[PDB]
Amino acid sequence: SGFRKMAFPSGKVEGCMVQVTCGTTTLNGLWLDDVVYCPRHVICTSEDMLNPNYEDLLIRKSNHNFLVQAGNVQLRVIGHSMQNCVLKLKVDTANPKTPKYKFVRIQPGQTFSVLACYNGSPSGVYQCAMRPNFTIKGSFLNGSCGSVGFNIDYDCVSFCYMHHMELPTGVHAGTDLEGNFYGPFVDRQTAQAAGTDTTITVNVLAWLYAAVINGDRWFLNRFTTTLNDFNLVAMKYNYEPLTQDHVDILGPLSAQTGIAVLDMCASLKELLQNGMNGRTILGSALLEDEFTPFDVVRQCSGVTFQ
Amino acid sequence: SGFRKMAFPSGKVEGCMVQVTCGTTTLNGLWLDDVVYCPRHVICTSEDMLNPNYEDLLIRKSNHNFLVQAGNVQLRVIGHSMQNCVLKLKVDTANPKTPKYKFVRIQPGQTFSVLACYNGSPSGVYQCAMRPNFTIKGSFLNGSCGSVGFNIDYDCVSFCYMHHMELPTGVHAGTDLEGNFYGPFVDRQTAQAAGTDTTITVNVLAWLYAAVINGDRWFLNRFTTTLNDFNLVAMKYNYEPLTQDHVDILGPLSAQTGIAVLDMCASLKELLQNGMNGRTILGSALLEDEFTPFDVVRQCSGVTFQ
Ligand SMILES: *[C@H](O)[C@H](C[C@@H]1CCNC1=O)NC(=O)[C@H](CC1CCCCC1)NC(=O)OCc1cccc(Cl)c1
Numbered sequence: 217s218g219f220r221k222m223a224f225p226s227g228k229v230e231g232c233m234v235q236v237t238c239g240t241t242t243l244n245g246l247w248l249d250d251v252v253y254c255p256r257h258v259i260c261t262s263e264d265m266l267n268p269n270y271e272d273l274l275i276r277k278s279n280h281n282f283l284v285q286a287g288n289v290q291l292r293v294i295g296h297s298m299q300n301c302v303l304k305l306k307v308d309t310a311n312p313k314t315p316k317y318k319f320v321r322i323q324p325g326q327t328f329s330v331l332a333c334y335n336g337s338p339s340g341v342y343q344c345a346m347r348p349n350f351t352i353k354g355s356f357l358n359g360s361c362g363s364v365g366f367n368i369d370y371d372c373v374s375f376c377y378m379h380h381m382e383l384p385t386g387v388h389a390g391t392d393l394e395g396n397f398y399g400p401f402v403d404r405q406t407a408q409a410a411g412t413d414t415t416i417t418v419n420v421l422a423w424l425y426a427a428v429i430n431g432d433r434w435f436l437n438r439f440t441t442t443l444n445d446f447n448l449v450a451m452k453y454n455y456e457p458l459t460q461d462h463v464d465i466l467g468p469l470s471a472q473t474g475i476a477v478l479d480m481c482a483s484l485k486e487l488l489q490n491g492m493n494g495r496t497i498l499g500s501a502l503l504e505d506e507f508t509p510f511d512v513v514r515q516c517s518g519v520t521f522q
Numbered sequence: 523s524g525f526r527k528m529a530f531p532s533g534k535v536e537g538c539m540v541q542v543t544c545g546t547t548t549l550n551g552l553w554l555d556d557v558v559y560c561p562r563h564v565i566c567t568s569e570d571m572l573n574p575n576y577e578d579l580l581i582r583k584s585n586h587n588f589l590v591q592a593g594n595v596q597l598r599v600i601g602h603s604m605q606n607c608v609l610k611l612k613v614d615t616a617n618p619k620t621p622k623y624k625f626v627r628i629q630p631g632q633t634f635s636v637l638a639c640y641n642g643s644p645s646g647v648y649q650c651a652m653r654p655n656f657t658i659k660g661s662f663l664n665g666s667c668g669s670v671g672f673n674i675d676y677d678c679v680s681f682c683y684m685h686h687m688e689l690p691t692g693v694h695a696g697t698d699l700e701g702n703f704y705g706p707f708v709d710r711q712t713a714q715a716a717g718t719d720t721t722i723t724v725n726v727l728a729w730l731y732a733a734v735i736n737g738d739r740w741f742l743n744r745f746t747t748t749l750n751d752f753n754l755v756a757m758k759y760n761y762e763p764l765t766q767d768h769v770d771i772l773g774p775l776s777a778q779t780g781i782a783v784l785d786m787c788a789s790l791k792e793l794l795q796n797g798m799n800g801r802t803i804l805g806s807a808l809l810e811d812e813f814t815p816f817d818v819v820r821q822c823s824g825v826t827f828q
């Protein structure tokens with residue numbers, strides 16, 4: 217028992233991280249087979265940021281302008297292309313440590329592990345959720361661009377995030393690995409703000425089930441509620457609407473705990489209206505929304521990876 | 523910016539995890555050079571747990587009783603010995619993925635990453651602290667024994683924990699890698715309880731500095747306090763005494779933030795006496811004590827590993 221924010225084991229991704237230097241900018245790249253993926257703003261300079269035309273900027277580059285270092289072995293770039301907001305550097309050596317992998321674009325509310333990196337070297341690993349406003353609340357300093365977020369499925373690494381920038385509230389924005397930003401953000405230095413966020417309701421419910429699985433029950437009640445009247449309460453507390461699809465996703469946890477989904481909704485209602493009154497749940501004094509239902513099942517059942 | 527509970531990158535340790543089977547028990551082992559380290563209670567059986575004499579139990583074993591599997595390659599045991607509560611299985615193949623490493627016994631209040639494992643396969647990675655009562659609040663199911671905790675220093679893996687059991691409060695107990703339990707616990711099935719825990723004061727202060735570095739300042743004040751009068755307040759709220767050595771350890775964070783250590787103590791005093799009044803710090807509604815001063819500096823300055 218116990219319940220922690222648990223990241224995926226990072227080894228498969230550590231073997232893919234490289235340093236990409238172009239001009240006065242250094243950031244991280246992702247080396248899979250003979251291609252290095254990195255944010256296209258690596259080709260910007262300190263005076264290009266304002267409103268760059270990356271097509272122009274890229275046609276002015278030569279392969280030899282891109283300095284790619286994999287540890288203490290430097291990689292020759294033999295070609296380059298742009299895909300949305302990611303640069304693909306073709307190198308003359310395939311990464312022998314390339315895992316089985318997929319590129320996936322995730323939905324808000326889904327979670328992933330971030331391998332935070334500087335100069336191609338990993339600093340640490342932690343679990344994030346994609347917020348409803350398409351930002352992540354990460355831990356990123358200068359040099360971290362090109363760090364990736366990922367999930368692991370049995371043996372396969374699903375890459376879903378590459379880091380590009382920090383918004384003025386201190387939250388983070390980036391792309392999928394095909395270079396499409398999450399959210400309305402652009403890799404331009406302009407007025408950009410996160411926008412209003414909401415709590416991921418289905419995740420809070422998953423975490424309440426985690427708590428029950430682990431012996432916290434003080435928040436349960438005999439009441440129930442309908443999905444309608446729950447969502448009426450959710451809206452007032454800035455929670456995402458709970459859908460019938462969410463309810464079905466919470467099915468397995470409901471079976472295992474013997475607590476119908478709509479009964480856990482009634483418990484969440486009372487926690488929203490009354491607060492926790494100095495109680496904690498799973499070591500938290502706040503309702504936690506960065507565990508998906510699958511995260512809970514994985515951790516409370518012991519799934520592993522090969 | 524941002525601040526997360528960040529684990530060390532786990533790749534170096536993933537390449538050392540193996541499955542150890544003896545009799546009806548399966549658990550994890552740590553394969554470094556030609557030795558596999560695992561909890562000695564692997565040699566117990568379902569009727570041995572009550573009060574086993576492991577010396578007797580071990581002299582009755584043959585090498586071929588230990589089934590060691592490194593993925594889909596099975597390892598022959600060519601010898602076995604006992605060191606305190608860990609079994610050392612000598613195998614005829616050295617692990618080619620052995621990192622540079624140390625065994626270290628940590629002090630309460632120090633943190634480490636846990637690579638949670640089942641059947642020799644990693645499940646997830648997360649950050650723990652050794653509690654003052656020598657337990658850890660982990661996330662461990664049956665089969666997780668032999669999972670290890672570790673820190674990384676530049677390029678070197680310092681192993682500091684191997685998992686053995688869960689106490690009745692749902693917290694976890696284990697040994698250093700030389701087999702000495704942390705705390706008064708024994709690998710015997712008897713009445714064993716964690717004992718009273720306390721909050722790691724120097725860590726709370728580190729985390730308050732993390733908050734300032736990241737733009738939370740609402741808890742600061744103009745007051746100061748003496749180390750004596752702080753510890754008088756600490757005792758009443760079940761906090762560890764703050765030592766002059768703790769104060770000196772918090773020096774770097776004090777410089778960088780311009781906030782004298784004793785002024786941050788005055789801020790912690792008021793948080794203890796008044797609570798947070800519905801405020802949060804770094805996303806938490808509780809005072810967080812599982813970040814050491816070194817953790818804060820590492821994360822807020824961007825240290826990496828090779
Ligand atoms: C890439 O390593 C870097 C990561 C940022 C720095 C601080 N936190 C992060 O996550 N990204 C940038 O610095 C980014 C660069 C621009 C270049 C032109 C196209 C759009 C991206 N700019 C950025 O994030 O500005 C905000 C910021 C806040 C605080 C410190 C800094 Cl250095 C930047």
Ligand SMILES: *[C@H](O)[C@H](C[C@@H]1CCNC1=O)NC(=O)[C@H](CC1CCCCC1)NC(=O)OCc1cccc(Cl)c1
Binds near residue numbers: 217566664688
């Ligand atoms: C080893 O994989 C296992 C890890 C425990 C199981 C549940 N959570 C854990 O951390 N350890 C044990 O099962 C341990 C075995 C004894 C054997 C005799 C010597 C001392 C250790 N016993 C144990 O932890 O009992 C408490 C417990 C609580 C809940 C479930 C279980 Cl299966 C055990």
